[PDB]
Design an enzyme around this catalytic site. Sequence first.
Site, PDB file in Angstrom:
ATOM      1  N   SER A 112       0.805  -1.206   0.000  1.00  0.00           N
ATOM      2  CA  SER A 112       0.000   0.000   0.000  1.00  0.00           C
ATOM      3  C   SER A 112       0.855   1.280   0.000  1.00  0.00           C
ATOM      4  O   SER A 112       1.636   1.506  -0.927  1.00  0.00           O
ATOM      5  CB  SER A 112      -0.961   0.002   1.201  1.00  0.00           C
ATOM      6  OG  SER A 112      -1.937   1.042   1.121  1.00  0.00           O
ATOM      7  N   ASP A 165      -9.480  -5.661  -4.074  1.00  0.00           N
ATOM      8  CA  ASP A 165      -8.921  -4.594  -3.262  1.00  0.00           C
ATOM      9  C   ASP A 165      -9.887  -3.404  -3.341  1.00  0.00           C
ATOM     10  O   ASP A 165     -10.098  -2.809  -4.408  1.00  0.00           O
ATOM     11  CB  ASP A 165      -7.535  -4.208  -3.782  1.00  0.00           C
ATOM     12  CG  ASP A 165      -6.721  -3.466  -2.756  1.00  0.00           C
ATOM     13  OD1 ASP A 165      -7.234  -2.453  -2.226  1.00  0.00           O
ATOM     14  OD2 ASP A 165      -5.577  -3.899  -2.485  1.00  0.00           O
ATOM     15  N   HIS A 196      -7.357  -5.743   0.251  1.00  0.00           N
ATOM     16  CA  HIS A 196      -6.150  -5.091   0.743  1.00  0.00           C
ATOM     17  C   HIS A 196      -5.497  -6.030   1.749  1.00  0.00           C
ATOM     18  O   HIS A 196      -5.655  -5.869   2.961  1.00  0.00           O
ATOM     19  CB  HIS A 196      -6.508  -3.781   1.430  1.00  0.00           C
ATOM     20  CG  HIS A 196      -5.431  -2.755   1.328  1.00  0.00           C
ATOM     21  ND1 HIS A 196      -4.961  -2.300   0.115  1.00  0.00           N
ATOM     22  CD2 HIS A 196      -4.729  -2.095   2.277  1.00  0.00           C
ATOM     23  CE1 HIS A 196      -4.016  -1.401   0.322  1.00  0.00           C
ATOM     24  NE2 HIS A 196      -3.857  -1.259   1.627  1.00  0.00           N
TER      25      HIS A 196
END
Length: 214
Positions: A112, A165, A196
């Site tokens: 991320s 995601d 995620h």
Amino acid sequence: SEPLILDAPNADACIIWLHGLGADRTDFKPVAEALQMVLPSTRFILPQAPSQAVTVNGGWVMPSWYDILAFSPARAIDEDQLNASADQVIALIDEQRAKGIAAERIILAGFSQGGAVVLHTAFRRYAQPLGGVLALSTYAPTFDDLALDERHKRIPVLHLHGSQDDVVDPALGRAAHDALQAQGVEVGWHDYPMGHEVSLEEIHDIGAWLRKRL
């Protein structure tokens, strides 16, 4: 804070892994420890993003590499904190070079927010060549501006993402991949049925890619 380290006897390589927004350097320890088994001569450095206010989250102070001023657009970030953190890595890179670890055997990794930071670092801030870069569920908020020199194209890259995601649009994810790709950079892509997060299959993918390069 200070970087958590997972040393390896007679080290000859190093992997610098960065966490997501608001996370503990210990977040990737289990992953580090495992990959260390396939790469026992590779040291692992998991730095800690400092505590900063995150505009998009009211103004809470949590571990942030750069402030995110808005869920949209992509550029909606504080570019200087990004450059700051980048420098924190460039710091770490050099330290390793000093201890004798070689460039091609130094790799940056980020999930991320972290991936943005290392992607930025390898192709925008750091001037010397690296051994590679691992992009875990991310995007490159700073790639609109891109004109790689002959050397930074020699940097192999691997992008990974969850199709589900719902935090980082896979599109922004491929985007980063397609951006580097279009400048003629050796890159790889792998998406997985997940959000995620990280997956076992994904790691096998990462380790494999690593075994081939370290």
